[PDB]
Swiss-Prot record:
It comes from the Eukaryota. It comes from Gallus gallus (Chicken). This is Lysozyme C. Belongs to the glycosyl hydrolase 22 family. Residues 1-129 form the C-type lysozyme domain. GO terms for molecular function: beta-N-acetylglucosaminidase activity; identical protein binding; lysozyme activity.
Length: 129
């Protein structure tokens, strides 16, 4: 499912991501935009052989099981395909574990590179929340 900006903002909000760990809603949306272009079906393979899945491009090396990443750790306890659903719940639960892990949102390269330090509030402007 390809989300609309405001639609995603409202779902993430509803899922408790606004200010989760001190990161405002616009950070989350900004990251989704740049990680997957708001598409829950986004997948991308990496050189280490791992793959990134979903709207937040969660990696199979640590976070989910895809059956083809030797040495995966499966920290969120889910199959990676659960991160491609139209229902963002598993993505959100898994993202909260990630962000709580120590480097915060820096875990997301597109976030660090394109969102961090910008006026991320722009991402939820005009939304009915």
């Amino acid at each position: 499912k390809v989300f609309g900006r405001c639609e995603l903002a409202a779902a993430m909000k509803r899922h408790g991501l606004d200010n989760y760990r001190g990161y405002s809603l616009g950070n989350w949306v900004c990251a989704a935009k740049f990680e997957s272009n708001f598409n829950t079906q986004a997948t991308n393979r990496n050189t280490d052989g791992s793959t990134d899945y979903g709207i937040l491009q969660i990696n199979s090396r640590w976070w989910c099981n895809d059956g083809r990443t030797p040495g995966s750790r499966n920290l969120c306890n889910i199959p990676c395909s659960a991160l491609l659903s139209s229902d963002i719940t598993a993505t959100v639960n898994c993202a909260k574990k990630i962000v709580s892990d120590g480097n915060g949102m820096n875990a997301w390269v597109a976030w660090r590179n394109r969102c961090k330090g910008t006026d991320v509030q722009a991402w939820i402007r005009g939304c009915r929340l």
